[PDB]
């Protein structure tokens, strides 16, 4: 909704910040096993709770 | 499996000493020692005793 609280807006801001693909320069580290970000979140599919 | 399985055993002192005596008696026979596999062919005397 357009009517938000400061706390809920801040929480949504953090989740939006962390919804991001990985940078490719980490893929070239020595002991790196990560291939993609497996904690992605599409708005339509996963509804984030709340 | 449980930790209170009977792990240890109990043997009488008399037959423990019996077994020690039997082992010592067997350890003085070249046939038995060579059967156990030791290379004692050049050993002068089997109950090999050296000074103190």
């Amino acid at each position: 909704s357009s009517h938000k609280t400061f706390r809920i807006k801040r929480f949504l801001a953090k989740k939006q910040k962390q919804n991001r693909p990985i940078p490719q320069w980490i893929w070239m580290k020595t002991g790196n096993k990560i291939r993609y970000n497996s904690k992605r979140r599409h708005w339509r599919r996963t509804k984030l709770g709340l | 499996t449980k930790t209170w399985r009977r792990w240890h055993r109990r043997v009488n002192t008399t037959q423990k000493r019996y077994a020690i005596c039997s082992a010592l008696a067997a350890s003085a026979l070249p046939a038995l020692v060579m059967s156990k596999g030791h290379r004692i062919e050049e050993v002068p005397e089997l109950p090999l005793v050296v000074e103190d």
Partner: protein, 135 residues
């Protein structure tokens, strides 16, 4: 006395446990008094208590409490034992005289079900299968 706090006297179970009226409390009223006195006075320490009066519906007791951080107590070598942390809330753990009275502890053939630290300690010592390595 103490009645069983059960909704509308409905103890769902066997008939042996159906009573709610004529029940009694294990601890004494003096011990209950000391307990709530110490509970309100959290920073103080309870020593003992005595009886000062009673009517049909009430009993009255006076509880003797000690402030453990007063220097007049801290510097006295014969009463600084109360300042040790092991004596914190004696009346809660039943260490005062009234609490000890309801624990059934003492020397002799009458108190056989308490030999050891306490009743629970005796029960635990008796109900344990000692399994030696060689049995």
């Amino acid at each position: 006395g103490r009645k069983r706090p059960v909704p509308k006297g409905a103890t769902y179970g066997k008939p042996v446990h159906h009573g709610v009226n004529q029940l009694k409390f294990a601890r004494s009223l003096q011990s209950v008094a000391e307990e709530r006195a110490g509970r309100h006075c959290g920073a103080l320490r309870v020593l003992n208590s005595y009886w000062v009066g009673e009517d049909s519906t009430y009993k009255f007791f006076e509880v003797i409490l000690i402030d453990p951080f007063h220097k007049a107590i801290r510097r006295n070598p014969d009463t600084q034992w109360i300042t040790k942390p092991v004596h914190k809330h004696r009346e809660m753990r039943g260490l005062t005289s009234a609490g000890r009275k309801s624990r059934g502890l003492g020397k002799g053939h009458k108190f056989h079900h308490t030999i050891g630290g306490s009743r629970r300690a005796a029960w635990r010592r008796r109900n344990t299968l000692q399994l030696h390595r060689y049995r």
